[PDB]
Amino acid sequence: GICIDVDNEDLFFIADKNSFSDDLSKNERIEYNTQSNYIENDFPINELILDTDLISKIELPSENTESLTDFNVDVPVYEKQPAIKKIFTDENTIFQYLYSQTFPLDIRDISLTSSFDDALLFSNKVYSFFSMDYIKTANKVVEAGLFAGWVKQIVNDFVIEANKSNTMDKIADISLIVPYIGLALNVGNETAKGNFENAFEIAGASILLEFIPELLIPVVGAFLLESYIDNKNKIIKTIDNALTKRNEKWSDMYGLIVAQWLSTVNTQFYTIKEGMYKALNYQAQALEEIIKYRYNIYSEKEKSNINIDFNDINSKLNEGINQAIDNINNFINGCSVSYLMKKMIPLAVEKLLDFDNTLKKNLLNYIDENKLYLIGSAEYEKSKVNKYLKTIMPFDLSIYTNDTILIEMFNKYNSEILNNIILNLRYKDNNLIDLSGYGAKVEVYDGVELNDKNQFKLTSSANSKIRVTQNQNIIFNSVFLDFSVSFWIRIPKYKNDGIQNYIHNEYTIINCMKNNSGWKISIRGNRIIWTLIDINGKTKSVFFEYNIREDISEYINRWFFVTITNNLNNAKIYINGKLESNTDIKDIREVIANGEIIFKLDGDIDRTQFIWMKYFSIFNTELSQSNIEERYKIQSYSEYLKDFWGNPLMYNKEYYMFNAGNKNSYIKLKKDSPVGEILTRSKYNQNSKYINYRDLYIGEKFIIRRKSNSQSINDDIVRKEDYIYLDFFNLNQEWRVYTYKYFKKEEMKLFLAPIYDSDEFYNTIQIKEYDEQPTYSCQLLFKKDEESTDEIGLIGIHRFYESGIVFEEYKDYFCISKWYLKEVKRKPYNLKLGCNWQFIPKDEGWTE
């Protein structure tokens, strides 16, 4: 079999658990003058160089003495061992994957391959972890006239491939990721297999480790307090000393975790980074070898006609490597800190909270036992304890190391907002799970409808409930509130005949309480409410209320994005990225915020009430405006268009049409004419003082049809740039929207007619999304043909000359317009242009 030589120092150094002291598990005797011990190896060197108590003042006695006559001594024995250790393994990890990217000194004519097995088999096949396209282009032989162009291109392709740095999309909440690391090294659990980014979303930094180490996390020992019977002054000192000692145990535990992190986990990540540096160098080297071999196949005539600089090729590739290494280093360093903060430190905090509990119990009992010898003051010392063991010691890495590189990567980690996510509920395999990395337990009961668009429905059923049990070892809100909640929601319209109960009956939707303190989200009709309840029962709320007398509401039964932030001074609600409300909460004392979270409708609700929700997240900091707006934009992104409610737009689904520039207008086939007239929406016609809306389920029933199954279907979702037919139902027939080919003016009425093939009419529409901000609107473009560059016009509404000469009568029609074609290129995109359309399907959350 193939044998690969590996230097000892390219192996992974991983300290064994036996390296670490379990002295923290020892008991401690606490007394009136017990001190807390801390060793600082960080030494002021100038204190030594100046110290004049250091160098001896005493004279050296004479070296002369009696002969040695006792020669007993142990003498070390040294022995060589073999310079080569042969081991047998059929595994392929970093060592094997790197070797597959090399070629021997007697080979020049190499080709790149994406097959690791081929690369090992054939000495002219070199493995590459870059894309199939890169590989194909590098293997390409061209004629001398094209060669210089092919060099430029493939060298630039190398720099682009090396610099790759994003996932499928930012909805995954991954800060940075270099997607080819798996393919480059196959470290960890076969990370060259499957999709690396996806596996990383599920499992995080752990997937890259070669070995998950067993951590030493000792049960901290009992404190044994000394009695000083009839000495108040020294009993108080003993309590104080036990409290100072408790801090030392926290500190020593964190130091113990840091030592293990550095010598079992961060060492593995270092080996990965070095591996990547070599891998990229191997790729560059192979490319250069390829470029040389191909250059030298050409004749001297050809060679003098080609201008290429080989040092320039080399420095451009090296420059690519340097930028790629920066990304890799930041990514891997983040992985290493992530493992420390999510997978190590919390298990320590768990043992230390248990110890704090036991110590608190002990210290109160000792204050009881000494109540007589501490008359009156006993209750004051009991509250000294309770208080002092309240604030949980923060982990600061810079206490345990002054390594600049480590401190800087820790700082970067803590300044990245996605690392503040402490709960991130996401759909996976017909369930919801926490993808934050802290492993909250999430129980979804049978009455919660889930779907793969990450939407979930809460109903009035008793079993329509989600329980989240939060990780108790996460520290957030140290001293003052500093957290945020974000989610999307869809709240159905009031029933017109149930308007009084809608207006008056508050119902909880999400409740997070422990010991009668915590937070909740509730709804009362058209108001969504965030409530804080502190340990003393003081209550503060902030709310967003949308107007239910709008002709057309942006919020009613439509998906919108909520973000709640809390800091020292204020609770704020943002809607769709914009601040809506603010409540001064300076009077709020402690709020217990890590009780179980129950998603469930609770209150005096109609049997038919429901709420949809999506992308529930909790952050352990106050998000800024700009963080929130970005999150809004990121979570709005899709390849698919959307309907009026915010759900994906579909083929073969009945839709009424809404115009964003003419909100109260709708399309009706004009009587005995094949054109679409524009009429005014009817409205709520009863007399509740609470209510006004315009009717939505009116005008022609449209339906979008796919132009061709020419490409892969597999679903009925409408995507941007798709070619469609826009059809509608006229009585029991299906008709179609056309544009007459001879289109002389700036605007022209659309032709609404039976399905029929005429050389005089265009029938093909490209559905567009010109807006760069989140929107449910789309645009409808007529082009000459699918492959044509030439644009005919956009579908819209315009006013056409109808009749009269002294007073001209004008009338609105459904039209095609050339004017919109220029308007849509203007920036920022005009949301309210009459070429912006939305499709309204019947929906159980809108009745009229």
Partner: peptide
């Protein structure tokens, strides 16, 4: 049907030429 379409086309032309 063909015949419908042709009659509708004439109606369209009359609308366009208002």
């Amino acid at each position: 049907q063909e015949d419908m379409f042709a009659k509708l086309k004439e109606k369209l032309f009359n609308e366009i030429n208002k």
